[PDB]
């Protein structure tokens, strides 16, 4: 057999809160993109999306 | 004018070997198929088709 080295960083990343962007008062560099946002809509779950 | 066969009739159009396949439409036992492992199916009787990736 053989053992690959990581091609990927298995390291997770977890944030409840922390330092935030100065511009947008938003979490600095998890990103929730459009389609992600879009799913809740089909579900019709408003306050989740809120 | 050419000396060779450039033309095609209907029955030569049989595509791929046939395998025993239950037609989920007409219940035929034979369906032709092709692959990609994405496996096509085409009914022998009603010509019904479906594909199978799994």
């Amino acid at each position: 057999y053989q053992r690959l080295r990581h091609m990927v960083n298995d390291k997770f990343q977890v944030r409840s809160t922390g330092p935030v962007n100065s511009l947008t008062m938003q979490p600095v560099k998890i990103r929730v993109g459009e389609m992600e946002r879009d799913a809740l809509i089909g579900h019709g779950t408003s306050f989740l999306l809120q | 004018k050419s000396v060779v066969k450039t033309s095609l009739k209907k029955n030569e159009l049989k595509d791929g070997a046939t395998i025993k396949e239950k037609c989920p439409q007409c219940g035929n036992e034979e369906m032709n198929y092709h692959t990609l492992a994405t496996v096509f199916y085409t009914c022998t009787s009603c010509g019904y088709k479906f594909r199978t990736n799994n």
Binding site: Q13, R31, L48 | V3, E12, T18, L36, K49
Partner: protein, 1462 residues
């Protein structure tokens, strides 16, 4: 967010304005006059950008608010402009009106007569009267007459308006919608069209000098032409009683014109009736000031230790540098004396003015729009401006608004476990420590919270921090036990401060199992890709752990691919997930209503053995497994004490079998009160496999017990009408949810006992199997050679070494087509070969048989793979295929250096006789490598994004009409039924519903329902209409009596029993018709009882209001497309491209429109075939046998001999009369022929004899004509040219012509082709589209069955409705070819959507353009372009769309808004 901070205030709408320098000065906190940045102490340079007035800077405190850098919101001042600057955005609209007005009368150069009527129609449409705007121009009866009519205009206007204000059709706010918005675009645009179409002033007849702008905003004024000065002065008495025009100059011009033209433009720039009654001002156009954002946003930046100034702050400097220098250059102007200024000295100051203006006007662009700005030093890149800041990447709307970085979430790899509950998720303790929840301190949970506090931050379950009523946050991290201990004692202590007495402390605890989270996996192609799931922390494992049946939902293969945990911070969000999107409700395909989840692989692999007739068990075994899976300590007790079956066999010995288990499984999971299922179904196995006379293919349940059939994916996999589907249907999902969850645990347990494996022996044939396998493969020898002789039209026994044979091959090898033609022939035969080895050896020739043969059992049970895999790996791989072809041949005529040229062997052409078992020859091997390389190269949303975006507002209302957020009707009834897609399944399953009736009666419970319902009128009315349709049955649609409308049309189905889609109504009756025998054999269940009941289910099946189907329709379409990434090999455009033509483009001309022509039955095939040729297009180049031209040199002469084929032949073939063939050349060919030769030359620097006479006369160079008037075999004629003329190449010139010949073309009709009679349908297929021309062929063809892809032309010819119907048909046919089912409801929704204007609408800038909703148009393409028109019309946005709601972060309008809290 903190819910203890309630805000009563609410944001209803947004308005648009242009900031005027006046208020700007009023609202300015400071001016920044100094280009200098910072002193050497870093303090703000006075009059510089960083002044503490705009806000605090570093450790300094704000000058304005005095606040720290923390609490200072910031402040912003102004920069005064010495010169008025064209606002570069407005510069176009601004420039437009410049040319329109007359500089003299200061009106617009068109008569004010027309100017008056538009504003009237404009005034109408602010209150939205569309057809009234047609009533206006209907009135018509010298300057005197011009007064009465335009006065008679106003009275009619206000009269109708006052009439409209009488009722509530429109209120003082006016009324504005899309069809409203339509003409407002149309008129004002075309209104502006007439602004540039008026040459002479209709008022004064004068001529104002033209203007010429730049992209850099420099407007040069072109001088008047003499004839203008001529007529100007002649009119100069009548009014009695290429150079830059300055910004100031242009301003004062329209200032008058605005005072002149205010009345008309009042309506132009006001989206709505203007209650503010403000007046248009030119000041809002220009820019006399510049506001600088607060320092904080303009703070410098850095990548690290290296600090960088903010780029816009640089753009701020050049404006301050250019201004002061101009402001100082102006200091020399006033010091220059008008008696020191000579006539030329006016130009050097004009050389200073135009100089000063361009630079400061270029800084405007460079600061705002670099595209409008002059480049700098050819390099250094444009500095980002505010305009460049908006559209960045996807745009700030899309990048930072439509998507965002968030908090309370994590990303990690996942791993399978069967052991959890499918609705749950495995949680590593690492996350448990970090993630917390704002626990409200209450009475009941008090002791618990104390413990986590005792636990503090690092002891799971922990309490990380604490908020008191004051809001004070307390971090226990550095805090010891007793520190926490007293605090714990203090947590419930009362409220000292008054304002907090209604408030309580709150706690942050580590997540516990009671909690739920939210999962997502990117990319998300459909809603199920995001679900919430119950939580269990799992000790000591470091990663998330997921159940298998959940994988298909997230479509995850356990590739190590990472997903996203999400932890809502409040109970509502928690509640929303748990009861809606969590798991169960999602069980069916929103598209097809099909099972989305189930067991996989080994699970299926297991079920076969357990359900075997060989399953036998001890009580010890029997008991353990039962309890092993169930765990009554779950919440799933139906019966506290475990309930069991007796053993099948008492004596000699006690025994249980596998089936009984499943019964026992059902036994204690199923509700006790309610009877067990009865079910009839089958599996995917043929009974013959098990032996002689098993029934086990059939599946049977009775009393919810297993009496026959083995389990299958066809059952507890994802399959329609499986037990799991059934129990979902009957008892409801939560049951089934458990039901599935049980199985895995059980099967897993079962695996642990007997396990499973593969074997080498598995792949061995018996001896004879190979002995067979030889025999057929032996005969394959000469196969190839024979296939050749037929194609070549040679004797079958022609040996492969025949030169002619070999010659024809090379000849054939030269053709692309013939080559492909050859293959399919060869392809066909060898396929039959293949269909023999496998059919004989699997399964009959295998060493191990099913069920012991695991390789077979996996494929057979459809656990994994198909006969294809095993067959090809055991019987042979057969002939390779490359994109419907064989291996391309080296131009040597050799497939491969191991093969002499032109060999007949199919193996020489890639026919693989090997099998992975016995190994493959290198040649064979090298081939397959190519075939492997296919899909890779082949493997080497943007669409759907467009759809979803436009469709956000789609939702259901209570009236069952379908609406956008503006309430526009789309579909009166949802699917024409309104039946939900989910419940849809069993509706047509009556016999199943016949059984279980009592249980079915249990679920629906008609009892309480009676109070709310009419039981009658529909049924009474329905039967009435039924008769009519029965009576009217056979007449055509347009003959159908319109007297009686669909029952649904007259009746709210939700309100009335019996309001029903007649098909359902009819099928039921058709069902009850023949199935009456059952009601005898029944339990006494009465057909009436049954009839009445089924109606309920139907009415129970109604879709909910407020459901947003658009999204559900959106995902339903774009998502499956992914699988169409590849394609097989009419021939139309396929896959996404064909799709894009429909939806994306709304293409006027698709590449391949095809008219579909059905024919009368009486016509034979020949006649059509004959007829096909007729309408077919013919070309000269087609009928030409050969051409021979001869040139000689007293002049340069050309004799031209053309040879055709036998007259009859093409006369038969292309249906040709030599007379046309004569006449065609006799007319058009010749006219074309001498024509180009002239250009060619110019480039260089009895009756026959009478027939020959005319052409020679009409055409210069023809000295002779002749033709074959009997056989038609040839045409031949002579031409001549000047002697001195240098050589021309006749052949090629002529060669070009005949290919351009049109012996007999058709009106927009190209080729007709006769396909095969599919589905008993007799049709011709054509290219090009003409209905009219076809309307003459009626003898051959019925007209009413003609269809096409040309839908625009259909819309053109036949109108909108029929066109819509085609739209659905085509789109279906796409997926149809791909064998992909979709609810037509999606389609019709999509269909009715694009037709709402009665026009054909793509989804793009155009289709979106009409949107009343603005921001949706903003985030779509261009942030600036739409932004301009908005303030231009001064639109107030009503906040209908979710997009806007998001923009302000607002609740759904719509989504919850359909519901109201009270």
């Amino acid at each position: 967010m903190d819910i203890s901070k309630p805000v009563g205030s609410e944001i209803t709408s947004v308005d648009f304005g242009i900031l005027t320098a006046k208020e700007i000065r009023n609202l300015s906190a400071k001016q920044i006059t100094n280009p200098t940045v910072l002193d050497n102490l870093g303090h703000p340079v006075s009059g510089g950008l960083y002044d503490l007035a705009l806000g605090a800077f570093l450790r300094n405190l704000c000058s304005t608010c005095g606040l720290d850098e923390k609490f200072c919101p910031g402040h912003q001042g102004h920069i005064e402009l010495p010169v008025p600057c064209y606002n570069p955005l407005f510069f176009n609209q601004l420039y437009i009106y410049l040319r329109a007005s007359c500089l003299f009368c200061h009106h617009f150069r068109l008569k004010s007569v027309e100017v008056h009527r538009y504003a009237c129609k404009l005034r109408l449409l602010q209150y939205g009267l569309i057809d009234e705007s047609y009533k206006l121009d209907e009135i018509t009866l010298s300057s005197t007459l011009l007064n009465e009519l335009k006065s008679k205009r106003s009275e009619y206007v206000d009269m109708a308006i006052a009439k409209a204000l009488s009722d509530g059709r429109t209120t003082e706010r006016g009324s504005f919608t899309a069809t409203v918005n339509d003409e407002r675009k149309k008129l004002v645009h075309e209104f502006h069209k007439k602004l540039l179409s008026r040459g002479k002033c209709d008022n004064c007849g004068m001529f104002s000098p033209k203007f010429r702008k730049d992209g850099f905003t420099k407007i040069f004024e072109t001088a008047l032409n003499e004839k203008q000065i001529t007529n100007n002065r002649v009119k100069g008495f009548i009014r009695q009683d290429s150079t830059y025009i300055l910004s100031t100059e242009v301003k004062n011009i329209l200032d008058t014109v605005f005072r002149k033209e205010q009345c008309v433009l009042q309506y132009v720039f006001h989206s709505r009736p203007n209650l503010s009654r403000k007046l248009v001002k030119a000041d809002s156009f220009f820019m006399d000031v510049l506001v600088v954002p607060p320092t904080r946003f303009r703070l410098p930046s850095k990548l690290g230790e290296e600090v960088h100034e903010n780029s816009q702050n640089q753009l701020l400097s050049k404006v301050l540098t250019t201004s002061l220098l101009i402001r100082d250059l102006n200091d020399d102007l006033s010091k220059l004396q008008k008696d020191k200024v000579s006539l030329e000295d006016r130009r050097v100051i004009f050389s200073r003015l135009m100089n000063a203006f361009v630079t400061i006007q270029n800084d405007v662009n460079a600061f705002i729009d670099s595209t409008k700005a002059q480049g700098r030093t050819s390099g250094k890149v444009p500095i980002p401006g505010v305009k460049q800041a908006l559209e960045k990447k996807e745009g700030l709307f899309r990048k930072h608004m439509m998507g965002k970085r968030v908090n309370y979430a994590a990303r990690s790899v996942i791993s399978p476990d069967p052991n959890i509950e499918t609705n749950e998720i495995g949680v590593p303790p690492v996350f448990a420590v970090k993630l917390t929840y704002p626990e409200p301190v209450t009475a009941y949970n008090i002791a618990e919270l104390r413990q986590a506090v005792i636990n503090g931050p690092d002891k799971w379950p922990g309490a990380t921090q604490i908020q008191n009523e004051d809001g004070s946050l307390v971090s226990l991290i550095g805090m010891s036990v007793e520190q926490r201990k007293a605090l714990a004692n203090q947590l419930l202590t009362p409220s000292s401060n008054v304002s907090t007495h209604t408030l309580n402390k709150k706690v942050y605890r580590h997540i516990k199992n009671r909690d739920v989270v939210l999962m997502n996996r990117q990319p998300t192609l459909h809603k199920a890709s995001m679900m919430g799931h119950k939580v269990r922390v799992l000790p000591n494992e470091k990663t998330l752990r997921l159940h298998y049946a959940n994988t298909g939902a997230y479509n995850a293969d356990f590739d190590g691919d990472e997903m996203n945990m999400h932890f809502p911070q409040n109970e509502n969000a928690r509640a929303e997930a748990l009861n809606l999107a969590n798991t169960d409700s999602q069980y069916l395909t929103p598209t097809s209503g099909s099972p989305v989840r189930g067991l996989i692989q080994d699970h299926i692999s297991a079920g076969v053995w357990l359900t075997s007739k060989d399953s036998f068990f001890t009580r010890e075994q029997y008991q353990q497994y039962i309890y092993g899976c169930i765990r009554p300590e779950d919440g799933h007790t139906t019966r506290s004490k475990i309930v069991t079956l007796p053993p099948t066999i008492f004596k000699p010995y006690p025994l249980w079998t596998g089936k009984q288990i499943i019964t026992t499984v059902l036994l204690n999971v199923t509700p006790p009160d309610m009877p067990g299922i009865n079910l009839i179904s089958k599996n995917k196995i043929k009974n013959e496999y098990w032996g002689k006379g098993s029934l086990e293919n059939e599946v049977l349940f009775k009393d919810g017990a297993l009496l026959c059939g083995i389990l299958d994916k066809s059952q507890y996999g994802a399959s329609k009408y499986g037990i799991v589907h059934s129990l979902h249907e009957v008892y409801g999902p939560e049951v089934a949810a458990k039901v599935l969850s049980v199985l895995g645990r059980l099967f897993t347990n079962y695996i642990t006992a007997t396990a499973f494996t593969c074997g080498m022996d598995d792949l061995r044939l018996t001896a004879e199997g190979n002995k067979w396998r030889t025999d057929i493969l032996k005969t394959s020898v000469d196969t190839g050679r024979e296939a050749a002789a037929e194609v070549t039209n040679l004797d079958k026994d022609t040996p492969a070494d025949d030169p002619e044979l070999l010659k024809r091959l090379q000849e054939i090898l030269r053709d692309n087509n013939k080559s492909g033609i050859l293959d399919a022939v060869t392809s066909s035969k060898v396929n039959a070969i293949t269909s023999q080895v496998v059919s004989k050896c699997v399964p009959d020739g295998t060493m191990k048989k099913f069920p012991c043969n695991s390789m077979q059992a996996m494929a057979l049970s459809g656990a994994k793979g198909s006969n294809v895999n095993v067959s090809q790996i055991m019987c042979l791989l057969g002939q390779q295929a490359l994109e419907g072809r064989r291996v391309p041949v080296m131009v040597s005529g050799k497939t491969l250096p191991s093969f002499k040229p032109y060999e007949t062997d199919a193996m020489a052409g890639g026919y693989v006789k090997g099998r992975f078992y016995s190994g493959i020859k290198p040649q064979e091997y090298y081939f397959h490598c190519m075939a492997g390389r296919e899909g890779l190269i082949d493997t080497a949303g943007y669409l759907q994004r467009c759809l979803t975006k436009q469709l956000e507002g789609v939702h259901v209302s209570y009236d069952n009409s379908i609406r956008d957020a503006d309430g526009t009707l789309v579909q009166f009834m949802y699917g024409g039924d309104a039946i939900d897609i989910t419940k849809e399944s069993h509706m047509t399953q009556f016999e199943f519903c016949l059984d279980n009736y009592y249980a079915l009666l249990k679920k629906y419970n008609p009892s309480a329902l009676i109070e709310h319902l009419d039981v009658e009128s529909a049924l009474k009315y329905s039967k009435k209409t039924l008769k009519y349709r029965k009576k009217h049955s056979k007449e055509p649609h347009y003959k159908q009596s319109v007297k009686y409308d669909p029952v649904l049309a007259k009746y709210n189905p939700a309100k009335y029993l019996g309001s029903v889609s007649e098909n359902f109504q009819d099928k039921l009756e058709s069902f009850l018709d023949k199935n009456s025998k059952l009601f005898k054999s029944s339990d006494g269940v009465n057909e009436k009882k049954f009839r009445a009941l089924m109606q309920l289910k139907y009415m129970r099946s109604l879709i909910n209001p407020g459901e947003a189907v658009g999204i559900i329709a959106s995902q339903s379409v774009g998502e499956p497309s992914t699988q169409m990434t590849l394609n097989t090999f009419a021939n139309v455009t396929l896959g996404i491209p064909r799709l894009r033509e429909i939806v994306m483009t709304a293409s006027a001309a698709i590449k391949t429109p095809q008219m579909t022509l059905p024919i009368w039955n009486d016509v034979s095939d020949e006649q059509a075939d004959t007829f096909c040729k007729s309408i077919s297009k013919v070309l000269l180049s087609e009928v030409i046998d050969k051409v021979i031209v001869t040139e000689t040199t007293a002049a340069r002469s050309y004799v031209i001999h053309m040879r055709f084929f036998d007259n009859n032949e093409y006369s038969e073939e292309y249906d040709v009369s030599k007379e046309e063939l004569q006449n065609v050349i006799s007319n058009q060919f010749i006219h074309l022929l001498e024509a180009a030769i002239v250009k060619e030359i110019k480039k260089q620097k009895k009756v026959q004899r009478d027939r020959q006479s005319a052409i020679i006369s009409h055409h210069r160079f023809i000295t002779k004509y002749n033709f074959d008037d009997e056989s038609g075999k040839w045409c031949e004629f002579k031409l001549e040219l000047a002697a001195d003329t240098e050589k021309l190449l006749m052949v090629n010139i002529v060669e070009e012509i005949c290919r351009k010949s049109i012996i007999r073309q058709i009106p927009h009709i190209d080729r007709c082709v006769h396909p095969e009679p599919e589905n008993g349908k007799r049709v011709l297929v054509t290219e090009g589209v003409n209905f009219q021309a076809m309307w003459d062929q009626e003898a051959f063809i019925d007209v009413d069955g003609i269809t096409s892809n040309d839908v625009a032309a259909v819309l053109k010819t036949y109108g909108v409705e029929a066109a819509r119907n085609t739209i659905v048909n085509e789109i279906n046919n796409v997926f149809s070819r791909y064998a992909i089912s979709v609810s037509f409801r999606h389609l019709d929704l999509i269909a009715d959507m694009m037709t709402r204007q009665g026009t054909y609408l793509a989804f793009n800038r155009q289709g979106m353009e009409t949107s009343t909703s603005s921001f949706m148009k903003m985030s779509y393409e261009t942030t600036c372009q739409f932004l301009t028109k908005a303030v231009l019309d001064n639109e107030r946005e009503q906040l209908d769309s979710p997009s806007a709601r998001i923009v302000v972060g607002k609740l759904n309008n719509v989504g919850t808004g359909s519901f109201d809290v009270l």
